[PDB]
Amino acid sequence: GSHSEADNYARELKREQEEIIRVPDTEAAEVAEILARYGIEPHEYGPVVNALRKKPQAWLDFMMKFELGLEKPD
């Protein structure tokens, strides 16, 4: 039929927040991996990671876009 389940966004949003809460250290290295793909060095991305960790809402939206390739609608 015509579809109305919470899409992949809604489902991924849930999963991603838990990880942040439950294994923040793992989610922080994920950001390193992502930025490191583009040649960036730890001394350059260290403070970025550090900024996101102190901002649980930002960090979630960051992971959504950078790790998972999905935009917050509106």
Count of residues that interact with its own copies, criterion CB under 8 A: 23
27 scored as a contact of Zn ion (CB under 5 A): yes
Chain residues 5-64 in contact with its own copies, contact rule CB under 8 A = 35, 37-41, 43-45, 47-48, 50-52, 55, 58-59, 61-62
Is position 61 an interface residue for Zn ion (rule: CB under 5 A)?
no
Footprint of Ni ion (CB under 5 A): 1, 19, 41
Q: What single letter denotes the amino acid at residue 58? A: A
**Dist. CA 74–CA 58, nearest whole Å:** 16
